[PDB]
Amino acid sequence: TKHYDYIAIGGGSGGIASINRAAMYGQKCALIEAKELGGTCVNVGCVPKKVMWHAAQIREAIHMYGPDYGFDTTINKFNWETLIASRTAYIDRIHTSYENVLGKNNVDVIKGFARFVDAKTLEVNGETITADHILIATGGRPSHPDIPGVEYGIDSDGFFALPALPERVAVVGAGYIGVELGGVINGLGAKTHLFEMFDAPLPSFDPMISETLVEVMNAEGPQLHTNAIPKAVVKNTDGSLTLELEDGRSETVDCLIWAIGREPANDNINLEAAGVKTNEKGYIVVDKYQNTNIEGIYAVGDNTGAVELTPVAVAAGRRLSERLFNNKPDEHLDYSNIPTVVFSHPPIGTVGLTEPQAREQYGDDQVKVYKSSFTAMYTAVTTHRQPCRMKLVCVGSEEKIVGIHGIGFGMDEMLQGFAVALKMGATKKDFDNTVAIHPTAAEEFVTMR
Amino acid sequence: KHYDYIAIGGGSGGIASINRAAMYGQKCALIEAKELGGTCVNVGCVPKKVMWHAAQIREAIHMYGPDYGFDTTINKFNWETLIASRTAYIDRIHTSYENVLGKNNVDVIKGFARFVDAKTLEVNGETITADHILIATGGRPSHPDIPGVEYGIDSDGFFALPALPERVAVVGAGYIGVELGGVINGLGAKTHLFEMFDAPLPSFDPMISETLVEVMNAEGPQLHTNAIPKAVVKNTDGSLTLELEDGRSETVDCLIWAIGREPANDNINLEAAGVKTNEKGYIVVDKYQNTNIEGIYAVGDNTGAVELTPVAVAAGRRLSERLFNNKPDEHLDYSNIPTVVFSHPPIGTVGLTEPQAREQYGDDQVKVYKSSFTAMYTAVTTHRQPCRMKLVCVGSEEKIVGIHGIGFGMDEMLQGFAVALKMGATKKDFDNTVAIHPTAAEEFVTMR
Ligand SMILES: Cc1cc2nc3c(=O)[nH]c(=O)nc-3n(C[C@H](O)[C@H](O)[C@H](O)COP(=O)(O)OP(=O)(O)OC[C@H]3O[C@@H](n4cnc5c(N)ncnc54)[C@H](O)[C@@H]3O)c2cc1C
Ligand SMILES: Cc1cc2nc3c(=O)[nH]c(=O)nc-3n(C[C@H](O)[C@H](O)[C@H](O)COP(=O)(O)OP(=O)(O)OC[C@H]3O[C@@H](n4cnc5c(N)ncnc54)[C@H](O)[C@@H]3O)c2cc1C
Ligand SMILES: NC(=O)c1ccc[n+]([C@@H]2O[C@H](COP(=O)([O-])OP(=O)(O)OC[C@H]3O[C@@H](n4cnc5c(N)ncnc54)[C@H](O)[C@@H]3O)[C@@H](O)[C@H]2O)c1
Ligand SMILES: NC(=O)c1ccc[n+]([C@@H]2O[C@H](COP(=O)([O-])OP(=O)(O)OC[C@H]3O[C@@H](n4cnc5c(N)ncnc54)[C@H](O)[C@@H]3O)[C@@H](O)[C@H]2O)c1
């Protein structure tokens, strides 16, 4: 058997962040990945989605806004194969960068699917390896509905494997992934329909965000269908698929994408053998320091049920290696006020409490909301004017800012800075005392009246 | 007629100060010779940004779209459509401005005002009088004193251009020169940029100058440093040949002076009010925007302070707070003002440059963090562009005194960081925040 100080199961965001930090303090480490390095983030998530988002932004420039700025252009050809080759080449160069860094840090990368032989032993490819500290960073995977014809839909992994852009696409589920892919496919030219079980897209976000998003979509696509509850998917005689809803609505398309949630990938690794406890949903239960109930086994990232975001798996994975191997016994991630950007059309940025949450937690007379609404300047000189709505949720006399939300051009790059100030306990007067930068969407948050 | 407060100038400073004064029950009049909005709405920040968004759309089509798979033909670029669309936007902004002043009960008087004495103004033959008078007259383009200077235009002339010239020389590679040069180059003209010093943006942090030289060497405009024009010859065919002191020469169709601005404080008879000006013609003001004469104040570009719209607005609303809302110490802190240059790519900077930080605190005390990466949007193209960022820290606590960057995203990311900088953030504050992925911005909280 080969023995290691630390082994990670999963070469995704959690797994790579922690192994490299531990390695960096002299721990002899092994990282085991069953598929490609970079996990979901690099291969079927964050990086390919944002290259697909920029491609959509380019077509809308050529085709929607360019006209009104005076450019008459013909798109002679949209070569999907060229987009997918540039996207894929870039991900192969990121794979090298990672192998390079794991290599300079002496981590042994093992490609195979690890299973637990007992609390301290893992078998991978018939070989048996052991360590004193094992990190399970297996992530998660797409959920699928138990309905007839479910097997005719693909999920977001199948989207990144698409050979061609289908002319008619239905995305079922309007959380992060359906809103983003719905925005992208729509923007790339396909007739898109977005179905959502509930009465609004992005149901859990602040109401101002969901409402603006409905407005924008009614005007530019995708075509939204709320209260949509999938009954079955019929494969038609000509090869198209008809989605049938419980209430009788139906829609016929060329490609159906299920974007209805992610389940955890914890089921096949023979956890029972190690005795690790998972909850009823199947996530590994961890405490505040990422520990499972078995001493020496940790878990970070999407398999734990925490907010499913790459930076969060990186910071909890990295702080776990600090705590364990660099003598900071209390290091641990603070899971509150974590910023998010949805790469929708237009992009959403949120950190903190939604206004509903603040009125529930603090009471109506304590909650003071500022709201600004304007037209993004990029769309203002065209016939496709688009709203930017922004909101600050404040509490108490001090007007301590407890929530910052915006939907508009600019939201993706503006939020980081404001979330550092939120972490610093900014009050509205702190925002008001900073000179604005003109002309930017950003400056609206420091001149809210 | 008698007023409590009159602003001379309906620009960024004049509008902000008067509407704030009107909120405290004062009787106000705004005087403006030309159009509401000043240099900012009319021939400044707003039409420049529309033009920047035009260049970006053309760069997207023409320079980056083929790598993402879009084979496009720009059949026609119609300059008249863009200008009509831009002009219409600006007429819309002017209607909002009238609307605000009117609801606030401000008298707007269209005319050019002149002092009769410290408390008296003549405008259109009328005499009006007040107890507090703000001079917010801003500045105008400077022009060199050389043979043929009248063949070149300045940034006002740029916004009045009937068509895009085929070949353009921008003389002056500071804020305006670098921003127009990058717009004109991105819109397809053969563009040259001339600067008398050895670097573009020579007072910015060195990392920003160095990175601009690099991208301009790759993508244009064609930069000529240590170049001082000697003369401009107009040719028989109507083109213009720019003659340099060092003998180098360039023949263009259009020349834009972007050599600096000068205060518009001269034909208003300051002498009768006794207000004093400095050697450069700017109105000398104190911390609270007071001139030497009691009852007369000045804000914005005509005082010599940093020429930005946020600054004239901020100083103007704080002056009304001081004067009309009993806040006697209210004033603008002119340190740590954020600035974005809408160059290609945009520059964002707030605080001390690394040279400045090292002089003031000593090498001994300064820690700098740096980041160079490729803009993700350009990474999949054959026109990959750098994105450089720098945090300047002092002390053991690593108090951040400077945040600088050049790259895609810099125009929108800087405002938040500048609040955190204004709150006294240390590098520990930046790194205790979770990153947003994937963004350019997450770089400022993950540097090591
Ligand atoms: C479409 C989509 C878009 C997204 N967009 C964003 C975004 O823009 N911003 C953001 O912050 N987040 C985004 N996310 C979420 C983000 O990608 C994940 O939260 C993040 O990748 C989670 O990291 P992780 O370490 O938990 O696991 P993962 O990155 O999923 O990787 C876990 C690894 O474990 C490996 N593994 C599993 N079992 C074994 C085994 N037994 N042996 C060996 N290897 C094994 C898997 O192959 C996998 O590579 C997106 C996700 C999706 C699906
Ligand atoms: C091309 C260009 C781009 C710029 N871009 C930016 C940018 O992106 N960001 C930024 O923040 N700043 C930018 N600026 C600078 C910004 O426009 C100015 O700093 C700001 O407008 C100055 O405010 P002000 O009130 O001092 O003067 P101004 O805005 O110049 O307004 C002064 C007004 O005074 C009026 N006036 C003058 N004399 C009289 C008189 N005697 N009687 C009556 N009316 C009179 C004038 O008609 C004018 O309207 C730019 C400037 C230029 C030239
Ligand atoms: N930019 C980002 O930060 C980003 C982007 C994409 C994904 N991610 C992460 O991955 C996570 C999982 O994303 P997701 O979108 O798959 O899950 P989700 O829960 O965010 O969205 C699922 C949506 O589909 C709806 N739905 C559920 N069952 C349905 C059904 N039977 N029929 C119709 N609609 C149904 C749900 O109401 C919900 O609105 C995200 O929550 C996020 O944490 C992050
Ligand atoms: N986005 C913004 O914030 C913004 C944008 C544009 C302008 N502004 C403001 O307006 C102010 C004035 O702008 P500006 O760009 O006209 O001037 P500037 O002072 O910024 O730059 C003038 C440049 O021309 C050079 N120069 C001077 N004489 C020269 C000559 N004879 N030949 C060749 N080169 C010569 C100078 O060295 C300098 O580099 C700026 O300081 C800025 O504050 C703000």
Short mmCIF file of N, CA and C and ligand atoms in Angstrom, two decimals, chain A residues 438-439, chain B residues 45 48 141-142 144 155 171-179 194-197 199-202 227-229 257-261 301 305-309 339-342, ligand 4:
data_model
loop_
_atom_site.label_atom_id
_atom_site.label_comp_id
_atom_site.label_asym_id
_atom_site.label_seq_id
_atom_site.Cartn_x
_atom_site.Cartn_y
_atom_site.Cartn_z
N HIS A 438 -18.09 58.49 -12.74
CA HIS A 438 -19.12 58.74 -13.75
C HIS A 438 -18.50 58.53 -15.13
N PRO A 439 -19.20 58.03 -16.18
CA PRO A 439 -20.54 57.41 -16.10
C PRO A 439 -20.48 55.92 -15.86
N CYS B 45 -18.15 63.43 -20.81
CA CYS B 45 -18.37 62.07 -20.31
C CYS B 45 -19.45 61.33 -21.04
N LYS B 48 -18.88 60.74 -25.03
CA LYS B 48 -17.64 59.96 -25.12
C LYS B 48 -17.93 58.49 -24.85
N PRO B 141 -10.82 73.72 -23.98
CA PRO B 141 -9.59 73.17 -24.52
C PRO B 141 -8.45 74.16 -24.69
N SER B 142 -7.20 73.81 -24.36
CA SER B 142 -6.08 74.67 -24.72
C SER B 142 -5.61 74.29 -26.15
N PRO B 144 -2.04 74.85 -28.91
CA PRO B 144 -0.67 75.29 -28.83
C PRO B 144 -0.41 76.59 -29.61
N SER B 155 -11.48 68.63 -28.36
CA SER B 155 -12.48 67.60 -28.16
C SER B 155 -13.90 68.07 -28.52
N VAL B 171 -2.94 64.62 -30.62
CA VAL B 171 -1.77 65.21 -30.03
C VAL B 171 -2.12 65.49 -28.58
N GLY B 172 -1.48 64.74 -27.70
CA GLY B 172 -1.65 64.82 -26.29
C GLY B 172 -2.09 63.44 -25.85
N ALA B 173 -1.32 62.67 -25.09
CA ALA B 173 -1.76 61.34 -24.68
C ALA B 173 -1.93 61.25 -23.16
N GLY B 174 -2.85 62.11 -22.71
CA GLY B 174 -3.33 62.10 -21.35
C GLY B 174 -4.70 61.48 -21.34
N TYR B 175 -5.62 61.93 -20.49
CA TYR B 175 -6.94 61.31 -20.41
C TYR B 175 -7.76 61.31 -21.68
N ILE B 176 -7.86 62.47 -22.28
CA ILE B 176 -8.68 62.72 -23.45
C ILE B 176 -8.01 62.10 -24.64
N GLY B 177 -6.71 62.37 -24.83
CA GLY B 177 -5.97 61.82 -25.96
C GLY B 177 -5.99 60.29 -25.98
N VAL B 178 -5.69 59.65 -24.86
CA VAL B 178 -5.73 58.22 -24.77
C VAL B 178 -7.14 57.71 -25.00
N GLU B 179 -8.21 58.32 -24.44
CA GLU B 179 -9.58 57.84 -24.63
C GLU B 179 -10.05 58.07 -26.06
N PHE B 194 0.39 61.37 -30.19
CA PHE B 194 1.68 61.98 -29.98
C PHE B 194 1.72 62.45 -28.54
N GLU B 195 2.82 62.29 -27.81
CA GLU B 195 2.88 62.76 -26.43
C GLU B 195 4.25 63.39 -26.27
N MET B 196 4.39 64.56 -25.65
CA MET B 196 5.71 65.15 -25.49
C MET B 196 6.61 64.48 -24.46
N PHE B 197 6.05 63.72 -23.52
CA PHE B 197 6.86 63.03 -22.56
C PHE B 197 7.12 61.66 -23.10
N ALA B 199 6.04 58.71 -21.99
CA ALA B 199 5.03 57.70 -21.70
C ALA B 199 3.65 58.31 -21.89
N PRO B 200 2.64 57.55 -22.35
CA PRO B 200 1.22 57.86 -22.20
C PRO B 200 0.79 57.85 -20.73
N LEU B 201 -0.19 58.67 -20.35
CA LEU B 201 -0.63 58.86 -18.95
C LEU B 201 0.56 58.98 -17.99
N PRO B 202 1.47 59.92 -18.21
CA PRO B 202 2.73 59.90 -17.49
C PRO B 202 2.62 60.10 -15.99
N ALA B 227 7.42 63.48 -28.64
CA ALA B 227 7.03 64.22 -29.85
C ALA B 227 6.35 65.56 -29.53
N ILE B 228 6.94 66.66 -29.97
CA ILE B 228 6.39 67.98 -29.68
C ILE B 228 6.12 68.60 -31.05
N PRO B 229 4.90 68.98 -31.45
CA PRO B 229 4.65 69.58 -32.75
C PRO B 229 5.26 70.95 -32.83
N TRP B 257 -6.17 68.34 -31.09
CA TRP B 257 -5.41 68.81 -29.94
C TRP B 257 -6.08 68.21 -28.67
N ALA B 258 -5.33 67.62 -27.75
CA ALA B 258 -5.78 67.04 -26.49
C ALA B 258 -4.64 67.25 -25.51
N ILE B 259 -4.22 68.50 -25.55
CA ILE B 259 -3.10 68.93 -24.80
C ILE B 259 -3.46 69.54 -23.44
N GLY B 260 -4.68 69.43 -22.91
CA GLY B 260 -4.95 70.10 -21.63
C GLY B 260 -6.15 71.06 -21.66
N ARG B 261 -6.66 71.50 -20.52
CA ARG B 261 -7.79 72.42 -20.52
C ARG B 261 -7.36 73.67 -19.77
N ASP B 301 -14.05 72.71 -12.27
CA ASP B 301 -12.87 72.89 -13.08
C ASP B 301 -12.33 74.29 -13.08
N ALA B 305 -9.04 72.29 -9.30
CA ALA B 305 -9.07 71.00 -8.64
C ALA B 305 -9.17 69.90 -9.70
N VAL B 306 -9.16 68.62 -9.30
CA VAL B 306 -9.17 67.51 -10.24
C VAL B 306 -10.41 67.55 -11.12
N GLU B 307 -10.21 67.50 -12.42
CA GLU B 307 -11.31 67.68 -13.35
C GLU B 307 -12.08 66.44 -13.64
N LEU B 308 -13.04 66.23 -12.76
CA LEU B 308 -13.94 65.11 -12.85
C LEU B 308 -15.33 65.64 -12.49
N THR B 309 -16.40 65.12 -13.08
CA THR B 309 -17.79 65.49 -12.74
C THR B 309 -18.19 65.12 -11.30
N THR B 339 -11.02 57.13 -10.14
CA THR B 339 -11.04 57.69 -11.47
C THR B 339 -11.06 56.52 -12.41
N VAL B 340 -11.90 56.58 -13.45
CA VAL B 340 -11.77 55.60 -14.50
C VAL B 340 -11.59 56.37 -15.81
N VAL B 341 -10.64 55.85 -16.60
CA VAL B 341 -10.24 56.28 -17.94
C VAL B 341 -10.91 55.23 -18.83
N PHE B 342 -11.73 55.64 -19.78
CA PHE B 342 -12.43 54.72 -20.65
C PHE B 342 -11.57 54.61 -21.92
N1 LIG C 4 -12.71 59.75 -17.72
C1 LIG C 4 -12.30 60.82 -17.02
O1 LIG C 4 -12.26 60.82 -15.79
C2 LIG C 4 -11.94 62.07 -17.83
C3 LIG C 4 -11.77 61.95 -19.21
C4 LIG C 4 -11.25 62.99 -19.97
C5 LIG C 4 -10.86 64.17 -19.34
N2 LIG C 4 -10.99 64.31 -17.95
C6 LIG C 4 -10.35 65.47 -17.27
O2 LIG C 4 -10.02 66.60 -18.12
C7 LIG C 4 -8.68 67.03 -17.81
C8 LIG C 4 -7.93 67.64 -18.98
O3 LIG C 4 -7.80 66.59 -19.94
P1 LIG C 4 -6.76 66.52 -21.18
O4 LIG C 4 -6.77 65.08 -21.51
O5 LIG C 4 -7.04 67.52 -22.25
O6 LIG C 4 -5.34 66.93 -20.57
P2 LIG C 4 -4.20 66.19 -19.73
O7 LIG C 4 -3.46 67.24 -18.99
O8 LIG C 4 -4.80 65.03 -19.04
O9 LIG C 4 -3.20 65.62 -20.87
C9 LIG C 4 -2.54 66.52 -21.75
C10 LIG C 4 -1.42 65.74 -22.42
O10 LIG C 4 -0.88 66.39 -23.58
C11 LIG C 4 0.54 66.46 -23.39
N3 LIG C 4 1.08 67.63 -24.06
C12 LIG C 4 0.99 68.89 -23.62
N4 LIG C 4 1.42 69.75 -24.55
C13 LIG C 4 1.77 68.96 -25.55
C14 LIG C 4 2.24 69.36 -26.79
N5 LIG C 4 2.50 70.65 -27.01
N6 LIG C 4 2.47 68.42 -27.71
C15 LIG C 4 2.31 67.11 -27.43
N7 LIG C 4 1.89 66.70 -26.23
C16 LIG C 4 1.59 67.61 -25.29
C17 LIG C 4 0.79 66.53 -21.90
O11 LIG C 4 2.08 66.02 -21.51
C18 LIG C 4 -0.28 65.56 -21.43
O12 LIG C 4 0.24 64.24 -21.51
C19 LIG C 4 -7.96 65.78 -17.29
O13 LIG C 4 -6.93 66.08 -16.34
C20 LIG C 4 -9.07 65.02 -16.58
O14 LIG C 4 -9.08 65.32 -15.18
C21 LIG C 4 -11.56 63.26 -17.20
#
